[PDB]
């Protein structure tokens, strides 16, 4: 459908939150200096 | 810089809150074919 | 459907995780004191 | 307080794990119209 | 459908990101030592 | 150890990026019944 186009929008958001997690896991694993 | 790559991070968290826009507004269109 | 009501539940969760990220990006960008 | 606004944060992460309840249980209803 | 099987995959990802958040909220609330 | 439970954390963030595989590829199958 076009709902299936928002599925890719939900997928796209989950996917990007994931990269914000790593960026932030980075800040911490570094902020242990 | 510091407060630069902290611009980049907070203005990606801009992008994701852009995707979360598009997704909430293919929803309140699915609340459209559920009017019928 | 009512599946489309859970879509709003998936959307609602992604949306709230997002705010936990910012709250946590805050803790770090502060814990650099 | 400190260990207060850390109550608030961990008991929001309560709320989200509430949404993630409701969503898993409109699923194991979609595993309902997929019985048929 | 089988789309409804990916819904459980989206649900499964949201669910696991959630645990990475707590693990990371832990790192911070500890890294305040 | 330290850099062990930091193995475990980064190689869970492996697992989730596994789920995010499976989900993107039941999508580019839904881009399948949308060919028709």
Swiss-Prot record, chains A, C, E:
Highest taxon in the source lineage: Viruses
Membrane topology: Single-pass type I membrane protein
UniProt-annotated location(s): Virion membrane; Host cell membrane; Host endosome membrane
Function: Acts as a class I viral fusion protein. Under the current model, the protein has at least 3 conformational states: pre-fusion native state, pre-hairpin intermediate state, and post-fusion hairpin state. During fusion of viral and target intracellular membranes, the coiled coil regions (heptad repeats) assume a trimer-of-hairpins structure, positioning the fusion peptide in close proximity to the C-terminal region of the ectodomain. The formation of this structure appears to drive apposition and subsequent fusion of viral and target cell membranes.
Assembly and interaction partners: The mature envelope protein (Env) consists of a homotrimer of non-covalently associated gp120-gp41 heterodimers. The resulting complex protrudes from the virus surface as a spike. There seems to be as few as 10 spikes on the average virion.
Name of the featured protein: Transmembrane protein gp41
Gene of this entry: env
Segment of the intact protein contained: 545 to 577 of 855
